[PDB]
């Protein structure tokens with residue numbers, strides 16, 4: 001099925017990556033600026049960037065691995081919870097509560113929309129029209145995704161929809177027959 | 180006879196040194212003078228590898244025309260230039 005994540009290992013890897021990103025961004029901020037600056041103001045007039053790159057990188061993947069472990073599956077919801085944690089880190093820079101709540105809701109919704117589609121900026125090679133079976137089916141095959149048939153099996157639609165509303169395992173007229 | 184062995188790694192070290200003297204110089208002519216030094220270290224490497232013809236083409240057009248072109252421009256033009264000070268370049 002799946003495999004649980006090392007929360008501490010992935011978190012400390014991302015902590016090192018966030019450290020390196022903070023260092024290269026502070027090095028970029030020194031040189032792309034004006035006025036009197038030297039070697040020591042790398043972390044003095046840094047704008048607080050290394051805290052951003054560190055805290056987001058820890059909180060996202062820690063919340064992601066923790067949510068994927070306690071739910072015991074992998075889908076787009078884990079990216080929602082992890083993006084909510086990232087919005088909590090990015091919302092605390094502006095020390096105001098309704099700002100903070102808005103960052104947590106909206107960045108979490110944007111990261112959940114990213115995670116639900118496949119959590120990829122690129123495409124999946126397989127499982128898309130050019131590289132997947134499409135069109136009609138040829139015989140009594142299990143209708144996969146991307147495919148069309150003319151009549152679904154009733155035992156499949158009763159499993160999917162339910163046994164309630166109007167849908168029944170026998171159509172209503174031959175259920176009421178004279179013998 | 181194995182004094183005559185390290186000849187390539189020598190010119191590699193000399194090219195490192197020569198670009199350090201390109202980008203750290205006072206006058207704008209001192210930089211192009213180390214640049215024609217860099218072209219001739221290159222042409223020595225190109226003879227060294229087994230290409231005697233190219234080295235002389237590099238002398239003909241790279242310490243040939245475009246050298247004279249740059250020396251010429253730096254003569255008949257004024258160009259302000261600061262020095263490599265620590266207070267303006269340690270931030271990089």
Ligand SMILES: CCCCCCCCCCC(CCCCCCCCCC)(CO[C@H]1O[C@@H](CO)[C@H](O[C@@H]2O[C@@H](CO)[C@H](O)[C@@H](O)[C@@H]2O)[C@@H](O)[C@@H]1O)CO[C@H]1O[C@@H](CO)[C@H](O[C@@H]2O[C@@H](CO)[C@H](O)[C@@H](O)[C@@H]2O)[C@@H](O)[C@H]1O
Nearest residue numbers: 074075076077115116117118119127128132143144145146
């Ligand atoms: C109009 C606005 C609405 C926005 C909707 C966008 C979201 C749409 C996403 C749904 C969809 C794209 C389909 C899109 C087509 C139309 C798109 C329309 C407009 C697009 C804007 C992406 O499906 C993604 O869903 C994610 C979560 O649900 C998963 O997250 C990730 O999970 C972890 C790894 O799995 C990651 O480790 C984790 O990191 C991620 O979290 C991804 O695995 C998954 O690829 C589904 O595609 C796929 O569906 C499956 C069946 O499921 C099909 O395979 C089937 O297998 C059998 C099963 O019967 C049958 O043989 C048969 O049935 C079929 O062979 C595929 O062929 C394939 O095609």
